[PDB]
Structure 1
Amino acid sequence: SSQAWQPGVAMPNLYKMQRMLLEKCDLQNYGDSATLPKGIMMNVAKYTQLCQYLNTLTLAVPYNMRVIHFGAGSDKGVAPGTAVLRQWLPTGTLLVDSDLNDFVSDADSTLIGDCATVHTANKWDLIISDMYDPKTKNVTKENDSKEGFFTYICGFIQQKLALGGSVAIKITEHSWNADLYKLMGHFAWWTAFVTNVNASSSEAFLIGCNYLGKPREQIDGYVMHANYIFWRNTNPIQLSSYSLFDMSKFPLKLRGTAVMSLKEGQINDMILSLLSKGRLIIRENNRVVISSDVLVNNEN
């Protein structure tokens, strides 16, 4: 109803609490397309609505903030999603992006290769992934938890997401991973968010808000994905571009959230409380250094 003026729809808590079996996703409005503002690309609209939704959460936004964006390339050879993130993020935010295939970017640095080749010395305050392989969408085959770049992402979050940081990871009916849902239980809060411009797709962004580095909650990811699909199957979402027309409050507010370096033994329940509120980031504040492993071959 009133959802049409939101940037999208977040999975209601009651669906998260169910124990559904996985079914096929059947969307009422499947194949319908939203009318986008003149000249505006789908992925600009989609990222704008994601960022508009992220504004309503308790993101930590420190000075010297660091954001990494996987799956940032497009078949057009540009990076629309990166351009939206850099618009949204406070000026000066360090933004790194990456994709399997070459593209031109507004990011401060871009790594081209399989995400599994990417390494960073530093931790990050926000990780965004739009990684997706359309080959996963096989409606004739059983829909099992996928590995591939999802395996990388789970490990990358546990190793390089600062405590207090957040993630938004694109999934679909067939592009999903059970450990990633389980890891959502390691954040203070989580949801699956559907953009209103793409409401007729099984796509969602799995958002983890304020990382705690340990389980607040034990989540069975197979069941949780079945719960997500059940939600999608029983709650048609009206396609809407309405929120794209109000950009007055779009920029993410630079909260200057505190950054502290702390050892695991120093993280007490008062620290955890601050992390949970978007009021603390734990990491060092040294140089951001990245690399991509390159496989060398001589075919002569």
Structure 2
Amino acid sequence: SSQAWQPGVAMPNLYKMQRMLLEKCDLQNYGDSATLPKGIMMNVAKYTQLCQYLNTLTLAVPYNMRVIHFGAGSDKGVAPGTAVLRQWLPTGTLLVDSDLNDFVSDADSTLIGDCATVHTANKWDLIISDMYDPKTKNVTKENDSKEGFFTYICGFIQQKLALGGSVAIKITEHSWNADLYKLMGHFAWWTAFVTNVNASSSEAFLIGCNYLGKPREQIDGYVMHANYIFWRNTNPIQLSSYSLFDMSKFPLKLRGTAVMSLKEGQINDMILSLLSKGRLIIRENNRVVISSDVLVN
């Protein structure tokens, strides 16, 4: 029997513990395609499977949840992933959108420009990034840890993610960052999730579940990305869109997670344990204010 009825496949724990050297990625199923339901675009399918997978973790879901979505624009000028996020998230969830280029979106607010121009006053409960630069897919250069928007994402997580909050960040064979992997060790749980509908690609979502302040595990990011490529190279994932046909349990369960503003070494071992089970968010609940920097001539 199969993972073909799952939304996707998560990196098994034994692969996280290896010490592999980086290899070229060579997917057995490179040219396969799932058969999408009629008229459904790949990005809708892909975000739906990510959300179906997130439904199985211990996400903190407060009242007045705050979600920010980077890399939300598409080359068609609409935002299919944030339409899926808005469908998944409880009604009334505050959802902010951003992309390099102009696009039309269902978010409550949209910032256009380089993510490095984006500032927010407050902390967030859930950060989704689909940011990707296709020019990183070059097989004639050594595959090194990438900077660019990954430097911003790492800083944004460390400064603007509430304790207890969660993260899902798109990576690929060539689009990755060693510090992002090291940051996954500051969550109560982490994985690399491959959606079944796009399993012919080296794309995965790095998912960090329940942010703690501190390193829980020490993770070497260069080794961990090598472990990820090794996993993908030796475990063909069958392309599948089966999970897209059962949406009866899709919306994220509204759990009313408690929100508290603690400070400093008020973070008891009891507090950390509540964070780790998805039962606590630590941040303020002021107004949400955002802005982008505008450079003048």
- TM-score, normalisation: structure 1: 0.98
> 1:144 matched to which residue of 2?
144
> Quick check: 30-39 or 252-261, which moved more?
30-39
**Superposition deviation, residue 8 in structure 1:** 0.2
2:9 paired with 1:9: yes
Deviation digits for residues 44-100 of structure 1 (CA, Å, limit 9, x no counterpart): 000000000000000000001000000000000000000000000000000000000
Deviation digits for residues 175-208 of structure 1 (CA, Å, limit 9, x no counterpart): 0000000000000000000000000000000000
SS of corresponding position for 1:3: coil
Q: Tell me, which stretches of 5 or more residues in structure 1 are unaligned? A: none
**Superposition deviation, residue 264 in structure 1:** 1.5
SS of corresponding position for 2:102: coil
Q: Quote the Cα distance in structure 2 between the aligned partners of 1:235 and 1:292.
A: 42
- TM-score, normalisation: structure 2: 0.99
Q: Quote the Cα distance in structure 1 between the aligned partners of 2:76 and 2:264.
A: 44
SS of corresponding position for 2:61: coil
**Superposition deviation, residue 32 in structure 1:** 1.6
Q: Percent identity among equivalent residues?
A: 100
**Superposition deviation, residue 257 in structure 1:** 0.1
Root-mean-square deviation (CA, aligned residues, Å) is 0.7
> 2:273 matched to which residue of 1?
273
**Superposition deviation, residue 295 in structure 1:** 1.0
**Superposition deviation, residue 234 in structure 1:** 0.2
What is the aligned length? 297
SS of corresponding position for 1:140: coil
**Superposition deviation, residue 2 in structure 1:** 1.3
**Superposition deviation, residue 157 in structure 1:** 0.2
Q: Quote the Cα distance in structure 2 between the aligned partners of 1:219 and 1:40.
A: 38
Q: Quote the Cα distance in structure 2 between the aligned partners of 1:264 and 1:78.
A: 42
Deviation digits for residues 240-259 of structure 1 (CA, Å, limit 9, x no counterpart): 00000000000001100000
Q: Quote the Cα distance in structure 1 between the aligned partners of 2:127 and 2:213.
A: 15
**Superposition deviation, residue 31 in structure 1:** 2.1
**Superposition deviation, residue 223 in structure 1:** 0.1
Q: Quote the Cα distance in structure 2 between the aligned partners of 1:133 and 1:35.
A: 26
SS of corresponding position for 2:193: strand
SS of corresponding position for 1:5: coil
SS of corresponding position for 2:3: helix
> 1:240 matched to which residue of 2?
240
> 2:62 matched to which residue of 1?
62
Q: Quote the Cα distance in structure 2 between the aligned partners of 1:265 and 1:188.
A: 18
Q: Quote the Cα distance in structure 1 between the aligned partners of 2:124 and 2:217.
A: 23
Q: Quote the Cα distance in structure 1 between the aligned partners of 2:231 and 2:185.
A: 19
After the TM superposition, which segments of 4 or more aligned residues of structure 1 sit over 3 Å from their partners?
Answer: none
**Superposition deviation, residue 265 in structure 1:** 1.6
Q: Quote the Cα distance in structure 1 between the aligned partners of 2:248 and 2:2.
A: 20
Q: Quote the Cα distance in structure 2 between the aligned partners of 1:95 and 1:262.
A: 24
Q: Quote the Cα distance in structure 1 between the aligned partners of 2:67 and 2:33.
A: 30
**Superposition deviation, residue 140 in structure 1:** 1.3
SS of corresponding position for 1:103: coil
Q: Tell me, which stretches of 5 or more residues in structure 2 are unaligned? A: none
Q: Quote the Cα distance in structure 1 between the aligned partners of 2:104 and 2:93.
A: 19
> 1:72 matched to which residue of 2?
72
